[PDB]
Amino acid sequence: TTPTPTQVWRATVPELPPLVDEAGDTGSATARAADTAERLLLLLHYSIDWSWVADPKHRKTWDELLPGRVRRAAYRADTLDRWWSEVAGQLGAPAPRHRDRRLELATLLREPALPVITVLRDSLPALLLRVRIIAEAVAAQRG
Amino acid sequence: TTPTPTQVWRATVPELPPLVDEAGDTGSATARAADTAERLLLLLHYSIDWSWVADPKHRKTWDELLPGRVRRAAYRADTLDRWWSEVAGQLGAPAPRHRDRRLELATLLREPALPVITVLRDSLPALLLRVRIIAEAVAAQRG
Amino acid sequence: TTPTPTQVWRATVPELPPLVDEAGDTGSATARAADTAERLLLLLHYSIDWSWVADPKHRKTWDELLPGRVRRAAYRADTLDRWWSEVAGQLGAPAPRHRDRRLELATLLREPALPVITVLRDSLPALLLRVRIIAEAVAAQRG
Amino acid sequence: IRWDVDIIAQSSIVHRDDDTFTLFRREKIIGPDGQILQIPLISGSSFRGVLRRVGEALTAEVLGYEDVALAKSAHPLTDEEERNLKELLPQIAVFGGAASGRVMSGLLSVSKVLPEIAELAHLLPRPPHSTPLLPAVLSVADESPLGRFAIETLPAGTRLQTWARLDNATEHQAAFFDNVLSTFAAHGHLGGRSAAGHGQVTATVTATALRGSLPRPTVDWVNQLADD
Amino acid sequence: IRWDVDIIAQSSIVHRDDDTFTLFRREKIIGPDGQILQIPLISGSSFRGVLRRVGEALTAEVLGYEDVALAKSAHPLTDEEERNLKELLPQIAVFGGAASGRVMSGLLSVSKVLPEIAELAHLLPRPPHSTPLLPAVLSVADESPLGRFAIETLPAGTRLQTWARLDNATEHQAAFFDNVLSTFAAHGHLGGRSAAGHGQVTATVTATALRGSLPRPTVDWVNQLADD
Amino acid sequence: IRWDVDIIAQSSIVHRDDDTFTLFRREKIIGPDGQILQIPLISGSSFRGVLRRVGEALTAEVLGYEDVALAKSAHPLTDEEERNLKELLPQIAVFGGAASGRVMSGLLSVSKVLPEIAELAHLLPRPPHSTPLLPAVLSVADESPLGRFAIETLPAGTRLQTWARLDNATEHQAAFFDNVLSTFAAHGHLGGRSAAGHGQVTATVTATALRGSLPRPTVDWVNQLADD
RNA sequence: AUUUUUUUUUAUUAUUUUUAUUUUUUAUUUU
């Protein structure tokens, strides 16, 4: 029914098939945690201005300081404290005037919430490759 | 259609005919895993600066420390954790500004993913001979 | 055209005429496997320092430990795993800075690859006599 | 009556040939398709000897062993040559022997084992693989100079196919041999280092293709006169 | 009598094969379902050797060791070949040896260990996992140039299944071997770096499946004549 | 004699693995209940090395150090192989070493540390908590470009459980090792940044479970011949 | 208008001993 605004993000790059399964989360438990982590970190790059230090690439806010800040915030428990530490760290913005993004985010901030921190630790840059690709493609369709 | 930037690597050394088959992966299952492993490890030597310790050969970053670090990262499961362990180990760089390499890499990071670790274990230096030859030849055509 | 650096090895001992045929591999199938095995094992004695245990003869690295290690590595399949087992066993070195040797070697590591293991099993020391004679003669012309 | 046995190994099967030196696996040749090849196989006499030891061990569980007078030899003492004991004693009647120079006649005939890929055994259970694959473990290096030893063996997963045969479908001897094969299927072994776990196999007996032995017959309780 | 033992590790189990270079784990092959695979396993002779050291250590706690004349060898002096001492001395009777060229016969037969996922051991305790998982710790880097070493080992949680066997249910030797397995279940170890905590395991002994040993028998107090 | 030690940290314990980049904590794997997990633990050889440094420091307080000729290596000079000094010198007899190619035998065997929640150590003092909690301090940022560093460490409140063992309850070496553990319980440390307060712990020694060492024995005053 | 019969290559042996990821680095300053 809903477009579920984290779905229309991933819909812009069909050359990358999905991670979880064909049509529903079956047969794997860490894939659900990885998908939740990717969706959560994807709803963190389009939630801010790019208001940080300015050069013509904005210093890769993307591997220059985003993995460091996400990793540093990933050393707290469980998930609400993590997002507070991140949003006070990096830039600071809840969500723009799109209530679908806000409701999806606040739905997401709680889960099993133990393996998500493990996913943010034991595989960071694959999720960053994913988020970089989706962000670049959905930017490319608005050029 | 696409140049598939791991194909234009292998195209520089026609004196080494391909491993898999004449025109398509038929009749062998371990050859697909070996080709995937060779392509994955080939997209790891041109993904970094050669930013490591500096002498006029860069200490063979090639059998001085690359097989050791690849082997050490090859003792985790399944493939995303492996690449995290490697990229945090050796140098650290996702991919340069060539989105074809990035998309091909992130397509590659998941597969059957069980026999690839076996291929990285039970035959390491043949793949290193391959990667050394292709790297040396494609460097030689830009001299 | 090419000197084919496994040919200039065998060229130093004309008192031993070749094994295969007069001018081309015709009329025998096991002779091709025997020649491939001899060339492969010849590109294994000049690929290392003689870095092993040191006495004024280097303990015949030649029948003291080379046939044992080659035989022990000859109990795996097919050829890449064999060379990994050997190079991790004996000393460990891919090839020196001579790209002709490296390209010839990596061309050689795959073949029919079934009868080569049979040749390494059912006739070891004749190949060792051959390799010892060529190594001794090409050492004697640089004395 | 013939017995077809399929034997799957559960460990390495070392079977010896006839300073830190190796020592090989017994190999017999075949001319399958015009060329000569060497293939490993346990000799058929080794299976017969293992069954002989099993039968002599089993015949002493019901007969007393406190008195005596195996692999028999030939020597003459007085040439006493009446041999009714074949009916009385069901062990030397089946497997033969030599008592006083006149050797006996054995009803049992047993064939060799054929593990590898050939055309000589009965019907195969699997699509084939390559021939020269009998890779070798490395031995124990005494370590009182630790002298490194090394043996050559079949891998733990090789199947083997064998048949044994008693021709004369006459009497209780078929049931006796059925009991012997039951023991060998239960906890049998064949090889050369059974004290180190080499040679543990599991077998199955099948295909009694002629007139079968009647159920519940006497094995050896025939009042045990216990003669020489 | 056979003894079935289940062994759960409590640390890494390094078992060596036969400049800053690695050194692998011993691997033996299986043909399980038509294809060749390499799996790690401690050789069955290593378990026998560990039990041999344990038995020789235990037999010296009740017999004096002030005089002598283990892994025996063969050499001839005068070929004295009377061997009643198997009844007198319960150590070389069970585990065998070589005294004066004529090697002994050992009643003990022990099988290999099988930790990984296969079809060769007895009944499994858990649903399986993948085969190639034997990840490796990294060693200690001497640091007098700190040369980085690295070894390969099984993880600390792997279960192992093994069986040992004495065939001849005769005499006190079953109780002696029961005492040896009690010691090995109490504070046993197997591996290659036991001085660094590698190889600590806990085992359980089960399934004496034949005629059991009578309670409270004599282990070795048979008046200790203490011959050669 | 074995010694059971419980070690409670008083600060962070950094233990390194083997541009403004981080550098992790050493992690070894376990297969506890069918799945593979990574857990942090100091390698058991590090504890042995710390005790080796403590023992060599303690043996020089009563023996003169003005003359010499630790982590020993192997090299041959003339192969002098009489080793009575194990009785004379109570340091290399316990902890082993290499003098002239022939390495020594160490009586000491020590196990790894296990801080986290598992099933491998001895009895637990507290109801458990979660596994992945080893949060990391951030380092000092040199500030001559202030390059921000960061290390990964255990928190200051983690308990650790370890056991060491000398098997041969023979002589004064038990008292010597008791003195070494007394020193380590008094002012011991283990970690990687002890110059910055990382690695301060307090321990307790318990459970001498076999034949105890007699009170007031000689540690090293055996007239100090001070040989090589 | 058989050179046929009977005839385990087998008992025994640890890849064991030794081995610190160590030493060095104010989140400084500016309202």
Numbering used by the authors:
A (entry chain h), B (entry chain i), C (entry chain j): 2 to 51, 54 to 64, 66 to 147
D (entry chain e), E (entry chain d), F (entry chain c): 18 to 35, 42 to 92, 107 to 181, 205 to 288
Which sentences did the original study use to describe this structure?
We reveal the cryo-electron microscopy structure of a type IV-B CRISPR ribonucleoprotein (RNP) complex (Csf) at 3.9-Å resolution. The complex best resembles the type III-A CRISPR Csm effector complex, consisting of a Cas7-like (Csf2) filament intertwined with a small subunit (Cas11) filament, but the complex lacks subunits for RNA processing and target DNA cleavage. Surprisingly, instead of assembling around a CRISPR-derived RNA (crRNA), the complex assembles upon heterogeneous RNA of a regular length arranged in a pseudo-A-form configuration. These findings provide a high-resolution glimpse into the assembly and function of enigmatic type IV CRISPR systems, expanding our understanding of class I CRISPR-Cas system architecture, and suggesting a function for type IV-B RNPs that may be distinct from other class 1 CRISPR-associated systems.
The type IV-B complex resembles a sea cucumber, with six Csf2 (Cas7-like) subunits forming a helical “backbone,” and five Cas11 subunits comprising a helical “belly”. Each Cas11 subunit sits upon a Csf2-Csf2 interface. The “α-helix bundle” topology of Cas11 and presence of a contiguous positively-charged patch running along the length of the minor filament are typical of Cas11 small subunits in class 1 CRISPR systems (Rollins et al., 2019; Xiao et al., 2017), although the arrangement of helices within type IV Cas11 is distinct from type I and type III small subunits. Like other class 1 Cas7 proteins, Csf2 adopts a hand-shaped structure with fingers, a palm, and a thumb. The palm makes extensive contacts with the bound RNA (buried surface area of ∼1200 Å2 per Csf2 subunit), while the thumbs of neighboring Csf2 subunits protrude into the center of the palm, inducing a kink in the RNA backbone and a “flipped” base at six nucleotide intervals (typical of other class 1 complexes (Jackson et al., 2014; Taylor et al., 2015)). Csf2 subunits are intimately connected (1021 Å2) and make a network of contacts with bound RNA (∼1200 Å2 buried surface area per Csf2 subunit). (F) Cas11 binds at the interface with buried surface area of 505 Å2 (150 Å2 and 355 Å2 with Csf2.3 and Csf2.4, respectively). Csf2 had significant similarity to the type III-A CRISPR Csm3 (i.e. Cas7) subunit (Dali Z score of 14.1), despite a sequence identity of only 16%. Csf2 and Csm3 superimpose with an r.m.s.d of 2.9 Å and use equivalent interfaces to bind RNA and induce near-identical RNA backbone conformations (r.m.s.d of 1.5 Å). Although the M. sp. JS623 type IV-B operon contains both Csf3 (Cas5) and the putative large subunit Csf1, we did not observe corresponding densities within the high-resolution cryo-EM structure.
